[PDB]
Each structure stands twice: as C-alpha cells, then as structure tokens.
C-alpha cells in the first residue's frame, strides 16, 4: 500500500508537470498572437 | 471547409494565408501528447533515485 | 484560375512525403553519425 501510494503521488506530480508545460506554451502563444494581431 | 490538400491552398484568401503565415511563424512546431509524457519522464528520471 | 494556381503550387512544391520518411531520415542521420 505504501509503495502504491508513492507511485500514484509520482504519477500525479508528473501529470501536473505536463499540464503546466502545455498551459504555459499555450498562454505564451496566445499572448504573442495577441501582439501580432494588434499590429495588423 | 477544413482542409483541401496542398494542391489547393490559395482558395482561402490573402489576409487568410497571411495570418496563417504569421501564426505558424510565431507558434512553435506542433507536438503531440507523447512528447509531453516523454518530457515528464525525463524530468522524473533526472530528479534521481532516492 | 483555380486549376492554374493548382498547377503552379504543385510545380513549385516538392513531392508530398509522410511522417515515416522524416523518421527514416532522422534514423539514417543518427546511424551515419557513427557508434561511440
């Protein structure tokens, strides 16, 4: 049980890291597209 | 409506394709879910084994 | 005009390749780098 809960904690941390990376990339692209669209 | 192959891509319009060019230029290469999973796996491998 | 721009874009764009071609090209590159 202890090994299992450690494993799920690691998996959850990994999923949060992946989601944070995707969100950061998307928000950066969105802001930069905002600046570009404002230019035109 | 969605995509007619590279044989026809002028059909959409000039502002259309111009904003297309600028969004491709300003957005990085498109990655899939496997890339992000592999990046997380590399991160947890680089943290080291306790 | 439709088919004329079609002809010019086919003429000016190379043959359409799939993902397997690019993966094989990368594989050939890393094989050509040599084994350490």
Report the b/e string of B10-49 with b at 16+ CB within 10 A. Answer: eeeeeeeeebeeeeeeeeeeeeeeeebeeebeeeeeeeee
Are B37 and A18 an interchain contact pair (Cβ–Cβ within 8 Å)? yes
Q: Among residues B21, A8, A1, B6, which one has the least CA distance to residue C8? A: B6
* Whole-number Å distance between alpha carbons of B28 and A33: 12
Cα–Cα separations (whole angstroms), residue A7 to B35, B36, C24: 21, 19, 36
Residue C3 at interface with chain B, using a CB cutoff of 8 Å = no
Q: How far apart are CA B35 and CA A29, in angstroms?
A: 18
Nearest residue to B28 via CA among A21, A10, A5: A21
**CB-CB neighbours of C25 under 10 Å:** 10
Contact list in A for residue B46 (CB cut-off 8 A) is none
DSSP assignment of C21-34 equals HHHHHHHHHHHHT-
Spatial separation of the C-alpha atoms in residues C23 and C18, rounded to whole Å: 9
Judged by CB atoms closer than 8 Å, whether chains meet at A18 and B27 is answered as no
Rounded CA Rg of chain A: 17
Chains that touch A (3 or more CB pairs under 8 A): B
Instruction: Look at the alpha carbons of B20, B21, B27, B31 in this order and tell me if their dihedral is positive or negative.
Output: positive
With beta carbons less than 8 A apart as the criterion, state whether B6 and C9 touch.
yes
């Amino acid at each position: 049980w202890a090994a299992r809960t450690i494993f799920m904690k690691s998996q959850i941390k990994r999923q949060e890291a992946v989601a944070k990376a995707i969100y950061d990339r998307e928000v950066r692209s969105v802001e930069l597209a905002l600046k570009i669209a404002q230019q035109q | 409506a969605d995509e007619i192959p590279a044989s026809e891509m002028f059909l959409l319009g000039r502002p259309m394709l111009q904003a297309r060019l600028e969004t491709l230029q300003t957005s990085g290469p498109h990655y899939e879910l496997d890339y992000d999973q592999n990046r997380a796996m590399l991160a947890t491998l680089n943290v080291g084994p306790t």
